Structure formats: C-alpha cells, structure tokens
C-alpha cells in the first residue's frame, strides 16, 4: 500500500493542481513528491497501455530516460483521489520564486534556463505530449546541478495536428488566438508561452496581464535587453501563429548560441 512505502513530509504546495507533499521512499530513502488529485476535479481521462487521469498517461509517455521533465515513479487510485509519486530534486527552488528574489536574470543565465526548457518541451512533443502550462511556476531549478525540471502536466493533452478548442492552463501565458477565438494549435501556442517565459526571465515579470495587451501585439521592454534577445522574444510573440518560429528556429537563433552547460550554470550563477 501507498502508506507503508512512502514517509510523508511537509506540504510543498497546493492549489488548482491539487496538493503536493515532500516524501521519502522508505526502501532506499529516495526523495519523492506525492501529488494528490481529487477524482471529481479530473476532467480528462485516458487508458493505460486501466482508466487513469490523462496526467498519468502523459507522464508515463515522457518518463523514459534522462530529461528535463519530472519523472513519474508510481501512482495509486483511492476511492476519491489519485496519488502520483514523482522524483524530487533537492535542493530546489521554483523559477517563479527565483525571479522574484533575483529580479531580471543576466542573459547568459536566461539563455541556459531557456535552452533547457526548450529541450524539455522538445522531449514532450517528441513523446506525443503537449504540456499546455509552460510558466516559471511550473519549472524547478536543481540548485546544485544547474538543471531545470518541467512540472505539472495536469493541464496537458496528447499532441495532435488539429485545432484545440479547450484550455485550462494559465491565461497570461495563453496566445491571442485563444483569447480571441478559443482555438489554438499546439506547437504554435507553446512557442507563444515560451516567448512570455523568456520575457519574464530577462525583464523580471511577464509582459501582459490583460487580454487587450495579449491581443495588442506590442512588447514594451522594461529592462535593458539586447537587440538579439528582444528580436527572439518578439518573434515568439508574433500575433499570427504561422509567423512564430519553430523549435528549430528558436534554437538556431543567434541569441541562443554558446549556451552554458548545466554545471557551469550552477557554478557561475547558483552556487
């Protein structure tokens, strides 16, 4: 049973995503996170290669190998909830709190972080998973290894090439075609959220709060940002989805060159 395999520690967070606790796997003292989701709150259901929440399906699809995505270790069904056991980086801070405390990040640091988010999102898409809630709050930084982890697949979907008409991610990271038409395509919408993230990193906060700003097409820079970085941001936040870069184009952008290794990032910017 769940209760004789994991020792439960403090609550790490709770909200729309459910309740997440720190834990330790009793057998080898491995650090884990234990996420609880109420059944009445699970909207999207899948079937496993058993009927489980879509989140479990998506996590299993991305859990193979080493990546910048959080790894599902196990899961349990209860009468009124599902419990997910995830790996837990330590020591860790989420990217939201990191930017709050440090302010606008040096571009070298934003380049390393953003590069790693790109690789993690490429991994997801390669595995047929669309995250749908890319934001600083959903990124953990392993402060010792300089490695980033994408968390909270609870808003995600199977990746398809047709239009999505549903969305329960974060509105301020959502693209103008969603705001205006309640329709988006997966990859192009992901690139928009990525531009919002990169702005957030180099400026200290997201560019837009209001629907009218999102749809407006104007990126005001509140911090000194290099012309190459401003250009990438603005390309990612092109109002027309087809004007947005592919993942390849992002990673081939001049601003993205000479990225730091994770360990160099940790040594220079985190230790």
């Amino acid at each position: 049973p769940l209760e004789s395999q994991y020792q439960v520690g403090p609550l790490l967070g709770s909200g729309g995503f459910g309740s997440v606790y720190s834990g330790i796997r009793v057998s080898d003292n491995l650090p884990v996170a234990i996420k609880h989701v109420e059944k009445d709150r699970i909207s999207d259901w899948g079937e496993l290669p058993t009927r489980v929440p879509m989140e479990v399906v998506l996590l299993k699809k991305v859990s193979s190998g080493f990546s910048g995505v959080i790894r599902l270790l196990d899961w349990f069904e209860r009468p009124d909830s599902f419990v997910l056991i995830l790996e837990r980086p330590e020591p860790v801070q989420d990217l939201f709190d990191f930017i709050t405390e440090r302010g606008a990040l040096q571009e070298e640091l934003a380049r390393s972080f953003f590069w790693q988010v790109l690789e993690a999102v490429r991994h997801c898409h390669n595995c047929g998973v669309l995250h749908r809630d890319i934001k600083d709050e959903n990124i953990l930084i392993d402060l010792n290894r300089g490695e980033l982890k994408l968390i909270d697949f609870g808003s995600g979907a199977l990746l398809k090439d047709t239009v999505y008409t549903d969305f329960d991610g974060t509105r301020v990271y959502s693209p103008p075609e969603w705001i205006r038409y309640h329709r988006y395509h997966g990859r192009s919408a992901a690139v928009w959220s990525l531009g919002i993230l990169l702005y957030d990193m180099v400026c200290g906060d997201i560019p837009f709060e209001h629907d009218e700003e999102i749809i407006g097409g104007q990126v005001f820079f509140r911090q000194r940002v290099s012309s190459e970085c401003q250009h990438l941001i603005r390309w990612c936040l092109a109002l027309r989805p087809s004007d947005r870069p592919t993942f390849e184009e992002i990673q081939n952008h001049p601003w993205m060159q000479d990225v730091l290794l994770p360990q160099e990032t940790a040594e220079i910017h985190l230790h």
Partner: peptide, 8 residues
C-alpha cells in the same frame, strides 16, 4: 510594480 502568481 506588483508581480504575482497566476492560477491555471
């Protein structure tokens, strides 16, 4: 200026 979290 006020920075805030945003629920999903």
């Amino acid at each position: 200026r006020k920075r805030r979290r945003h629920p999903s």
